[PDB]
Amino acid sequence: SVLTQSASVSGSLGQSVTISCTGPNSVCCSHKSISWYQWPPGRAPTLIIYEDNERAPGISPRFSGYKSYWSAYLTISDLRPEDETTYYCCSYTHNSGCVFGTGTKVSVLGQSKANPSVTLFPPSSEELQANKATLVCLISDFYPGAVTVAWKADSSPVKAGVETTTPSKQSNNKYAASSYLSLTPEQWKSHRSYSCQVTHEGSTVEKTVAPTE
Amino acid sequence: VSLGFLGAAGSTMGAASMTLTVQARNLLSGIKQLQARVLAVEHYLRDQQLLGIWGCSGKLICCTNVPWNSSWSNRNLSEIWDNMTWLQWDKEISNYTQIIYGLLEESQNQQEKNEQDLLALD
């Protein structure tokens, strides 16, 4: 897209943060109104700002807009956990539709740490009949939203059949993710135990299952 | 454009506010007829009476000193004047019209004239 936003910006808790929105004169500011949207992934967006300064109904006064001749800006004051998400600007006139920007992901620093919740499930007996074997390692309520997952077969790494999802934001403003390990029934039965290790820069957690029990 | 009497009843309040003379013209112009004609001039003189006590007799629009209490409506300028019709507006402000009219005669005109006497007293 020819309408560029700051790819990332960061602000501290209780502080303010500013997102930029600029591009060529063919799309930018003097003769074009600018609007701002909050757009969480996987959900419907919310209009916060339209016509430059003027904020949408019900929007808190924490949000403010400003447009210069060369670029436009959006300021979010008194940052909250829910403000940590993706934001888009649009350039438009009355008769001409939206041109969406490249997008900006906002990170809120100074937030409290959340301990990870790890749960590991073995393959079902109905699944062992099929005959396949999939271990499921579910992770929730961790912050910041970044994980690294490692699997082990009899205390030794595994590399075939590992699939891990990206981290996803929970309704409670914590994060979640999951990982799946596909195995053949012989590898499952031929080992003493399997393990799912979730590593975070602050703490590494290990959950272990065994085919014996 | 002139759309006629009540032509902008279904337009936005801002668009309708431009053609107040249109509604104003036809607003004034045996026993059944006579009783009806009396009722008509009676209602017209009632509204002109209210414009009188609000100091706005000769004008269609006048500004006031009463501030807009946000409890009445939480909308803004753009949302009121470019998204709503006078009809649905009058329905939303149907709990305050009596209240607002009372504040309208008292807050300003009942104090505009007292201050006028104390000011022109020299």
Partner: protein
Amino acid sequence: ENLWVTVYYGVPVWKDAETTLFCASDAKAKHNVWATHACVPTDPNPQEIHLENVTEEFNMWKNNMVEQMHEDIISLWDQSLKPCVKLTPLCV
């Protein structure tokens, strides 16, 4: 950001109301009960004004124009009978 109330006179606003209507008909050349001696002549042209975008609820069954017309026809009938010959002696 400081808002003050403003008066508008002649706004397109109406409410449901019941009022006393009256008759109207073009003048013709006699003496039919409904027209009576006099009913106000109609305007040469009525102005039917379309109201775009306007949606209003109608109720033909709770309508008062019906009850008014009903009592009008009845009363007109009696107003036309008074001056004519009463056949009280015809009960022989």
